[PDB]
C-alpha cells in the first residue's frame, strides 16, 4: 500500500468542512484550516488555499493535490531533521510511511523528541521501540491510531491496514 491509502485510512477524506479530533476545521486528507472557531474563517483558507470560492467545498482532485502537497511537507521535515533524516534513511519501505504518518500527525519536532524510540528504530530494535512509543500521550491520545502505527513497527508489513 500507498501512503495516500494509509492516510485516507488513519485520517479520513472528505470533501466539506469538518471539526476534527480536537473540534479544528479540517477538509480532505488530514488538513488543517483553523484552529478558530469560525467556520467562517475556514472556509476563507478553504479558499485561499485552493485559490477559488469552495463555500468549504472542494474536488477530490483539489483533495488529492492538498494531500500531496502535505505529505511533501513532511518529508521534507524529515529531510531536513538531524533526528529523523539518518532513522529514515534506515527504514525499509514500509516503516519509513509510518515515520511520515506520524509526522503528518503530530510534527517534526513533536516527533523527534522520542529520542530512545528513534534510536532502536534503527539499530532494528522493533518490539523495544514499541514498548518505548506505548508510553507517550500520543499513544493515549490515539490509540486506535498509534496501535497500527506501531504494531506495523512491529511487524514490517500493512498486515493491520486491514
Known amino acids: 500500500m500507498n501512503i495516500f491509502e494509509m492516510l485516507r485510512i488513519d485520517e479520513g477524506l472528505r470533501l466539506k468542512i469538518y471539526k476534527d479530533t480536537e473540534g479544528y476545521y ?14 467562517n474563517a475556514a472556509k476563507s483558507e478553504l479558499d485561499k488555499a485552493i485559490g477559488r ?13 492538498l494531500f500531496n502537497q ?15 533524516k539518518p532513522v529514515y534513511d534506515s527504514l525499509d519501505a514500509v516503516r519509513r510511511a509510518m515515520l ?24 532494528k530494535r522493533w518490539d523495544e521501540a514499541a514498548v518505548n512509543l506505548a ?12 496501535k497500527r502505527v506501531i504494531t506495523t513497527f512491529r511487524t514490517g508489513t500493512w498486515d493491520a491496514y486491514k
Do not use: C
Request: glycine share 8%; proline share 3%; charged share 20%.
Open 53 to 65: 470560492n469552495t463555500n468549504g467545498v472542494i474536488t477530490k482532485d483539489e483533495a488529492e493535490k
Open 26 to 39: 479540517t477538509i480532505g486528507i488530514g488538513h488543517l484550516l483553523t484552529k478558530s472557531p469560525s467556520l
Open 100 to 123: 511520515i504518518n506520524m509526522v503528518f500527525q503530530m510534527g517534526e519536532t513533536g516527533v523527534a523528541g522520542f529520542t530512545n524510540s528513534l534510536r532502536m528504530l534503527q539499530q
Open 70 to 84: 502535505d505529505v511533501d511537507a513532511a518529508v521534507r521535515g524529515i529531510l531536513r531533521n538531524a533526528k529523523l
Open 135 to 146: 508510553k507517550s500521550r500520543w499513544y493515549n491520545q490515539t490509540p486506535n491510531r498509534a
